[PDB]
């Protein structure tokens, strides 16, 4: 324009670049945006019911294949016969089986004691897990109503009760809508109120990583701001270990001896698992916990294999390389791999030869190979989300856990490159300078390989840090049953006798803004953590002393009732303004609205006790010319206090002069108006 | 010289714009690339095959 020969075009270039910088950051936020694992819920074999009871199985190298279910009506005498090929016999004589299958809380989830007998056990441990994956991600499970949040559940349709043409007595129309894989992801979105893509995918034993991949690819784009991705296989009938045994694919002892010379086949188990997932710059902007980031995912069918159940050796290399070129990484960044490790004698040699071809390509540091199926058995469709719970507790515990049955590494694989180090021992895995990435791979019977690359959470240096010890807030307990509320203060009590000195403010933040406002409420506000331990033990027995118990029906709607006269004491709020500036300042606006209409101000009145109010020209109560405005000022400041603490009235009602305060707080009369 | 900054900072603007015209038609193909229906097979109620 004027100076030199550039003052205008160099503004359109600045803009064409900050538009190119902001349009090529939109391409990397739509196909490669990290998807944070906000929380994990998991009920796995071996009594595992939470991913801190799941690390207490991997870290001690405990196998959870311990025997067939007894409480499930299984015919444990017709499942076994000396003949290897009978028609109804099963070859797995063990396996990882949970007792949480024949167990559910119908009343909590709003289903009748007849609609729930018909709920497939794969739907009843997805509703329970959906409540937990949210109650441990912070997000109140009842706060996600009409919120875009996809439920992506992986399920191998399994057969529960009477055939749909043989309807029961109470379970009749609800036998198809409680068992259809359709309504496992759908029951969750209904009970939780979610309005997002509630898709129940089915890709055999990769339906958890496919559901995780289908949720990550539903997030990178944006159709659901949040997403519950996971999968469950709880086997109601012994109909899967009696068919898988008919193709002689099972092991006679139920162990998935991964990458081991004793490999017999799958050690088929049953389990669940759910991940709460959100775009990394949506779980940092909302403060949600970020446990690990799912960098990239890939799904790749085996193609024309040598059998439907037969694995492809060059369709896994193209899925370990699609998830490795969609995450923007390379084969040398992934420290460890949670491989399938089915324990098969022709699927493990093919898996690992696909792992010396996509990862073990001149590896400077050996790849730490493992499988969670070794610890719990093949959890089928829950495997792949039980590998992103194994390699997300491996992120956050600084340790690669064991592969429990692989000391005698199989002789059908070539472990000569020294590029893969099967995890026969707990390998330390601390936070170094290079990000800690892992790979979880689930390949299925249908021939749909899936591979997901996990990375450790970006090191949060400060985040929500420390401030100063001050007034303590109520410890907010609530449950949907009077016997479940005793169990809440029988599990928070333990979560503090196991973890003592836990900041009270932190047990009143993630209990109040971390849980749902369920009917049976027992909040309380102690002196400290150890003072609350007393009330916790009292509520375990139902004895409320120091605890504020109550009952509700999702009630809300408080009413500010305003007494006119007769509620004054000699020291009304003497320290209520000395402890918080939300009452002192609340008094300040009333005072400056009372100064032009009153001489003596309210500030020194409630500041001083009656024993010291006798010398400030303001009697304790008899001065109706002074205490009536004081009453109104105390009243309005207190009402503003409850409003500042989130207590808003559905109605204000005043008695005689509390009418003035009610009008002041209702908005019909200004602060100065009602003050005058 | 190159017509100082008249034929240069304007030569970099036909790249930073022609790259913006190709990094925005990648976003219109990552979100709204219209997919075809190349063929349709149906076995539906009745004689439909």
């Amino acid at each position, epitope marked *: *324009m*004027a*100076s030199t020969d550039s*003052e*205008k*075009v160099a*503004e*359109y270039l*600045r*803009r*064409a670049t*900050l*538009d190119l910088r*902001a*349009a090529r950051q939109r391409i990397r936020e739509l196909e490669g945006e990290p998807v944070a694992v906000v929380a994990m819920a998991c009920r796995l074999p071996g009594g595992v019911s939470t991913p801190e009871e799941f690390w207490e199985l991997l870290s001690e190298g405990r196998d959870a294949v311990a025997g067939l279910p007894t409480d499930r009506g299984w015919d444990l005498d017709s499942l076994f016969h000396p003949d290897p090929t009978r028609s109804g016999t099963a070859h797995q004589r063990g396996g990882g089986f949970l007792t949480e299958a024949t167990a559910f809380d119908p009343a909590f989830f709003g289903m009748s004691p007849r609609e729930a007998l018909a709920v497939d056990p794969q739907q009843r441990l997805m509703l329970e897990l959906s409540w937990e994956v949210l109650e441990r991600a912070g997000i109140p499970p009842t706060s996600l109503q009409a919120s875009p949040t996809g439920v992506f559940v992986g399920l191998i349709p399994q057969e529960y009760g009477p055939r749909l043409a043989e309807g029961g007595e109470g379970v009749e129309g609800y036998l198809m809508t409680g068992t259809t894989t359709s309504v496992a992801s759908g029951r969750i979105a209904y009970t939780l109120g979610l309005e997002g893509p509630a898709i129940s995918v089915d890709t055999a034993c990769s339906s958890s990583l496919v559901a995780v991949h289908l949720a990550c690819q539903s997030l990178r784009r944006g159709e659901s701001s949040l997403a519950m991705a996971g999968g469950v296989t709880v086997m109601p009938t012994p109909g899967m270990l009696v068919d898988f045994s008919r193709m002689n694919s099972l092991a006679p002892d139920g162990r998935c001896k991964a990458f081991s010379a004793g490999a017999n086949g799958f050690g088929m188990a049953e389990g669940a698992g759910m991940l709460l997932l959100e775009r990394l710059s949506d779980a940092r902007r909302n403060g949600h916990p970020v446990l690990a980031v799912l960098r990239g995912t890939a799904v790749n069918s085996d193609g024309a294999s040598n059998g439907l159940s037969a694995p492809n050796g060059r369709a896994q290399v193209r899925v370990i390389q699609q998830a490795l070129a969609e995450s923007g990484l390379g084969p040398a960044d992934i420290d460890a791999v949670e491989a399938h490790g089915t324990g098969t004698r022709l699927g493990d040699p093919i898996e690992a030869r696909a792992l010396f071809e996509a990862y073990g390509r001149d590896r400077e540091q050996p790849l730490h190979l493992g499988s969670v199926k070794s610890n719990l058995g093949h959890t089928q469709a829950a495997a792949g989300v039980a590998g992103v719970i194994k390699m997300v507790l491996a992120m956050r515990a600084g340790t690669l856990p064991r592969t429990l049955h692989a000391s005698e590494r199989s002789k059908e694989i070539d472990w000569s490159s020294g590029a893969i180090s099967l995890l026969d021992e707990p390998e330390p895995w601390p936070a170094g300078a290079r990000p800690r990435r892992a790979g979880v791979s689930s390949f299925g019977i249908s021939g749909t390989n899936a591979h997901a690359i996990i990375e450790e959470a970006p090191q949060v240096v400060e985040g929500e840090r420390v401030e100063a010890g001050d007034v303590v807030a109520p410890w907010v307990l609530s449950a949907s049953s009077a016997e479940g509320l005793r169990a809440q203060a029988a599990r928070l009590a333990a979560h503090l006798r196991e973890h003592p000195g836990q900041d009270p403010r932190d047990i009143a933040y993630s209990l109040a803004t971390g849980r749902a406002a369920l009917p049976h409420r027992a909040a309380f506000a102690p002196v400290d953590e150890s003072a609350a331990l007393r009330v916790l033990d009292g509520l375990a027995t139902g004895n409320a002393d120091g605890a504020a118990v109550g009952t509700s029906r999702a009630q809300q709607r408080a009413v500010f009732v305003f007494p006119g006269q007769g509620w004054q004491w000699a020291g009304m709020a003497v320290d209520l303004l000395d402890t918080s500036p939300v009452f002192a300042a609340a008094l300040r606006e009333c005072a400056d609205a009372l100064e032009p209409h009153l001489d003596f101000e309210v500030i020194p009145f409630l500041r001083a006790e009656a024993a010291r109010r006798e010398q400030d020209a303001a009697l304790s109560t008899e001065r109706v010319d002074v205490v009536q405005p004081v009453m109104f000022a105390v009243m309005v400041s207190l009402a503003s206090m409850w409003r500042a603490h989130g207590v808003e009235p559905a109605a204000v009602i005043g008695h005689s002069q509390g009418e003035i305060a009610a009008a002041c707080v209702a908005g019909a009369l200004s602060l100065d108006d009602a003050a005058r | 010289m190159a017509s100082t900054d*008249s*034929e240069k900072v*304007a030569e970099y*603007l*036909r790249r930073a*714009t022609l790259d*913006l*015209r190709a990094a*925005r038609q990648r976003i*219109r193909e990552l979100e709204g690339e219209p997919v075809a229906v190349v063929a349709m097979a149906c076995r539906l109620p009745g004689g439909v095959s």
Partner: antibody
Amino acid sequence: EVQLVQSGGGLVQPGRSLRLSCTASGFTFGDYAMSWVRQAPGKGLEWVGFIRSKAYGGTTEYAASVKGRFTISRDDSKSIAYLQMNSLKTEDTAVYYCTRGGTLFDYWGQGTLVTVSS
Amino acid sequence: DVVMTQSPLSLPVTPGEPASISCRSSQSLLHSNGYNYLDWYLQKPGQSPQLLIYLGSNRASGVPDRFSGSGSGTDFTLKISRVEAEDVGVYYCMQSLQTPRLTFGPGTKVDIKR
């Protein structure tokens, strides 16, 4: 983000001195050439002036309507643009904006309502 | 001299219907670089003016894809592919060839059409 948040409106009598501050946070303040566009109540935008970048000289170009009256400055270490409005008359009752471009107005800020009434 | 730019000052838009504001310049805004020096600004009613288009056809980031840009050296056009309830206001055709520009133009007074 870039946010050009402004401050400094108010009520004065014709012939006063008023300061208009443009807080720039999100971009390198010294690269752009901030400008101040006036919009009298309910009519079209009129451009008051703009300071060149410190690297472009810092020459300040003003309008014909406000030459010898207004002066515009900028600081990087304190990262603020200034419209120094001296000898105001009745015309300055308006919503003054601060855009981040001499020929390519960008963020525009928010809108500082300045009023010059007697 | 100065570039005099005019437009359909009182253009009505009905929601969901493509609309088209046009600009006509007396002089030629196609500078030698082959880049037009016309910009399209939007002042939404009672808000800070927005930059919709720079260099005639290029759209600023953060601006809805609806606003499309085109034009020769004299006649120009803004093609809103989809007018919604935020697409209403004043659309200023503002040149860049001859800085300084004391005015942003009369601006196209856009209205929801009935």
